[PDB]
């Protein structure tokens, strides 16, 4: 009952998992008036969301999602929220990872005029209209697929207006990487705030991954830090392992954030492609350190340095892989224009 | 400050200044803010816990946008509601006694029996425009000032309030926002916890004497069964007072006798009490009146107030009759009196 839940939230009592899941389902289904949805989303944030509430909302979104089944896939995706406007590094990293493992990403086009994963993929020529059966086929043939939230999380449209009108960030903004509709059992999860590492790692531990690594990077980004320390949690059935890593532990000097910042999807696309051509080493290094940790989550390397070395071999083959991905699901002529502009 | 910065502020648990809260209330009450954002703000205020400055600013905002008549020498006896007990409309009954000895300016909305509802069952015309309102106070020493007429801007938040279905800041401001600006006030509060908070707010809201009262077991009235905690507020400051029901020279009143299931049932119980046919309802009315009398400095103490309330209650049905005949339908009152006899 929406009314007692709200009173409970107002009193700063944490919800149980099933309480939270039913709450999320009613909201996502559009069964709850906008006024009460706004009330609930604000109350959750001001109370401070608990593990049980994160797990419940995650399971609700997964259950209401349109699904495919690629449990052996990896995803590398973040919560967003840092807003530094840096290159779409997880998208580039997915391309390296697809050479050696199935990859399934998901998400939305960004608001204008930001650059999300969907937008950089589209600038590269990718067709984000991918029905489930096609998605299955695409992953089999090319080890990569992008699953648009519009199609795979279609019920999220029912909370869109409250979310937009509120402006502020809510529980929904930290659920993205925990709600992969391909059921990817391996996950590199970026989190924008150091204070959310603990909540989300503990939540992740009950969301049934084989291995999920949560990363927060200085100066405040949902990625492996190119400037300094990365604070990470390694979650498995064995438990949660604390890890602190500096960029120097990859064998490289700190990358200046200036070099990673982008001003459009195309610019992000150009940066990525130049890194694949060996013409932008700062972005390549950023891509590679993020891939290195993803490789570690897959249990393909024994440490992060080896992952970084191994990513170097993958980046050299990535433009060719990008071409095969886009030729199978997209317009190769858009990739070639980006390549010309990258040369 | 625009609305989105205000919400940011409230989500970060920063208290608003009086003037900020007042300008925030005005925007909300004028209908300038989307319902989703009004919902968010009211919830954040409650999550944060509203401060004195916020209470004062919101109240002043309502006062500003109210339609005003001038009757400060009037007394009001009114509560915030809440607590879950569906009791007889005791402050409205008390108003009828008090109108014998002082002008009374009641105000509020329909609820399932609020003050407006009982009055209408008795036959009162609850919509009284300003000019004739002052007229009826002059003539009968009593008027009810409907929030629908006198707080029209509040129509802009009625939906959000009802849809939220939880108490908000607006639910503690009713007795602080009389459109006639009565300088003497008995203010009911349903929780001990807000007594200090509301009394400190009231102290900055320019009453000559406002008495705030919380009654066990958890109602916005003088306690019929036990202890009443109260704050006497004036220019002199805030005075603490503890008062058992035995201090009125009576025993505990069985709570069940005070509970009501319709507006007509509240009306019958009140009339019966005036006829001397429901002594428990009578006692409930009288202990609350006693405290009103004390606010008006009509009595030296609450025992004296109670005793004098008994004199007043014997004239109250005839007073009720003159009030309703001057503004409403007496044939409804008589139908109730027949149900009561
Ligand atoms: O704002 P939202 O739509 O909720 O999305 C949150 C973030 O998730 C995506 O990152 P992802 O890690 O998937 O890709 P990227 O690192 O390549 O941008 C995205 O591009 C945003 O940065
Ligand atoms: O729910 P709301 O509309 O905001 O009203 C709150 C209370 O204010 C009125 O009491 P009042 O003290 O004026 O009369 P009573 O104590 O005689 O009922 C009313 O009947 C409610 O109990
Ligand atoms: Mn990312
Ligand atoms: Mn990022
Ligand atoms: Mn009352
Ligand atoms: Mn009451």
UniProtKB/Swiss-Prot annotation, chain B:
Q: How does it assemble?
A: Homodimer.
Record's GO cellular component, any one?
cytosol
Pathway assignment reads: Amino-acid biosynthesis; L-tryptophan biosynthesis; L-tryptophan from chorismate: step 2/5
User: What are the leading ranks of the lineage?
Assistant: Archaea, Thermoproteota, Thermoprotei, Sulfolobales, Sulfolobaceae
Q: What GO biological process term is on the record, naming one?
A: L-tryptophan biosynthetic process
Q: Which Gene3D superfamilies match?
A: Nucleoside phosphorylase/phosphoribosyltransferase catalytic domain, Transferase, Pyrimidine Nucleoside Phosphorylase, Chain C
Which SUPFAM superfamilies does the UniProt record give? Nucleoside phosphorylase/phosphoribosyltransferase catalytic domain, Nucleoside phosphorylase/phosphoribosyltransferase N-terminal domain
Q: Which cofactor does it need?
A: Mg(2+)
Q: Which residues take part in binding anthranilate 1?
A: 79, 109
Q: Which residues bind Mg(2+) 1?
A: 91, 221
What keywords were assigned to this record? Amino-acid biosynthesis, Aromatic amino acid biosynthesis, Glycosyltransferase, Magnesium, Metal-binding, Transferase, Tryptophan biosynthesis
Q: What is the effect of changing residue 221 to Q?
A: Affinity for phosphoribosylpyrophosphate is similar to that of the wild-type enzyme and catalytic efficiency is unchanged
Query: Catalysed reaction per UniProt?
Result: N-(5-phospho-beta-D-ribosyl)anthranilate + diphosphate = 5-phospho-alpha-D-ribose 1-diphosphate + anthranilate
Question: How many cofactor units bind, and how?
Answer: Binds 2 magnesium ions per monomer.
InterPro entries named among the record's database cross-references: Anthranilate_Pribosyl_Tfrase, Glycosyl_Trfase_fam3, Glycosyl_Trfase_fam3_N_dom, Glycosyl_Trfase_fam3_N_dom_sf, Nuc_phospho_transferase
Q: What is its EC number?
A: 2.4.2.18
* Descriptive protein name: Anthranilate phosphoribosyltransferase
Annotated family? Belongs to the anthranilate phosphoribosyltransferase family.
Q: PANTHER family from the xrefs?
A: ANTHRANILATE PHOSPHORIBOSYLTRANSFERASE (PTHR43285:SF2)
């Amino acid at each position: 009952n929406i009314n007692e839940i709200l009173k409970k939230l107002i009193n700063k009592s944490d919800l149980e998992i099933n309480e939270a899941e039913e709450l999320a389902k009613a909201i996502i289904r559009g069964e709850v008036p906008e006024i009460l949805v706004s009330a609930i989303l604000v109350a959750l944030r001001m109370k401070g969301e608990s593990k049980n509430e994160i797990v419940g909302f995650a399971r609700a979104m997964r259950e209401l999602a349109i699904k495919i089944d690629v449990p052996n896939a990896i995803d590398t995706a973040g919560t967003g929220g840092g807003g530094l406007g840096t290159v779409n590094v997880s998208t580039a990293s997915a391309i390296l990872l697809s050479l050696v493992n199935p990859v399934a990403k998901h998400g939305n086009r960004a608001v204008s005029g930001k650059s999300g994963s969907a937008d950089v993929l589209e600038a590269l020529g990718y067709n984000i209209i991918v029905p489930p059966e096609r998605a299955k086929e695409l992953v089999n043939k090319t080890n990569f697929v992008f699953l648009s939230a519009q199609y795979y999380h279609p019920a999220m449209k029912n909370v869109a207006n409250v979310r937009k009108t509120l402006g502020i960030r809510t529980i929904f903004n930290i659920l993205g990487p925990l709600t992969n509709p391909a059921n990817a059992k391996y996950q590199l999860m970026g989190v924008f705030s150091k204070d959310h590492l603990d909540l989300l790692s503990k939540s992740a531990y009950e969301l049934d991954f084989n291995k999920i690594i949560l990363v927060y990077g200085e100066p405040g980004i949902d990625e492996v830090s190119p400037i300094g320390n990365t604070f990470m949690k390694i979650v498995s059935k064995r438990g949660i392992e604390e890890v602190k890593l500096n960029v120097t532990d990859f064998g490289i000097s700190p990358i200046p954030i200036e070099k990673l910042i982008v001003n459009s999807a195309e610019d992000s696309a150009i940066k990525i492609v130049r890194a694949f051509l060996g013409k932008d080493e700062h972005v390549a290094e950023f891509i590679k350190i993020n891939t290195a940790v993803a490789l570690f989550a897959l249990d393909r390397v024994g440490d992060f340095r080896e992952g970084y070395e191994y990513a170097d071999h993958l980046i050299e083959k990535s433009l060719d892989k990008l071409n095969e991905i886009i030729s199978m699901n997209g317009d190769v002529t858009k990739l070639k224009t980006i390549v010309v502009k990258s040369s």
